[PDB]
Design a binder for this molecule. Structure first.
Ligand code: HEM
Length: 153
């Protein structure tokens, strides 16, 4: 459970993301795919994209990045009180998309990289630590759900 201060650092940098949710989403998904190319394979929709420029030009990828960040933003705003938001996400990601926790780690890493790249002044050690805790909590709670649904374990 994060402190209120930590939550406020998370939400402070997130407001920056909200200024251009699509461009942030693009940067994060591109980062994910560059750093962990195996992930691009569960997006049957994108899995054919080969260059950075192709990724930037893809409407579908741009849409997807907004979908991810919109959901995650709503989650972070709940300050850990996010059971109702995680429920449908766990369902689809455990039972349909089959996204292992390690991939959620990979996308967490990409979020952290992009937020530090674009907003370093709002993403010092203090804020990085808070975001890391928030994303860890999301992972921890979604993993418990996954198991309830019969995934992983
Ligand atoms: C912060 C992490 C994530 C959030 C908040 C998130 C959220 C979403 C939401 C809201 C949707 C659409 C509704 C639904 O199907 O549940 C979705 C779809 C999907 N997501 Fe995620 N997601 C994340 C991580 C991932 C990761 C890491 C992968 C793969 C490596 C992934 C792959 C999938 C796929 C394949 C779809 C369906 C896309 C399509 O229609 O072509 N997600 N996600």
């Amino acid at each position: 459970v994060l402190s209120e201060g930590e939550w406020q650092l998370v939400l402070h940098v997130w407001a920056k993301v909200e200024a251009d949710v699509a461009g942030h989403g693009q940067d994060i998904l591109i980062r994910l795919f560059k750093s962990h190319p195996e992930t691009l394979e569960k997006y049957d929709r994108f899995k054919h994209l080969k260059t950075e420029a192709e990724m930037k030009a893809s409407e579908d990828l741009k849409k997807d990045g907004v979908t991810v960040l919109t959901a995650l933003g709503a989650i972070l705003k709940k300050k850990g009180h996010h059971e109702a938001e995680l429920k449908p996400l766990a369902q689809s990601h455990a039972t349909k998309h089959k996204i292992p926790i390690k991939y959620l780690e990979f996308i967490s890493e990409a979020i952290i990289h992009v937020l530090h790249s674009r907003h370093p002044g709002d993403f010092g050690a203090d804020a990085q630590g808070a975001m890391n805790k928030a994303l860890e909590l999301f992972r921890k709670d979604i993993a418990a759900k996954y198991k309830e649904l019969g995934y992983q374990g």
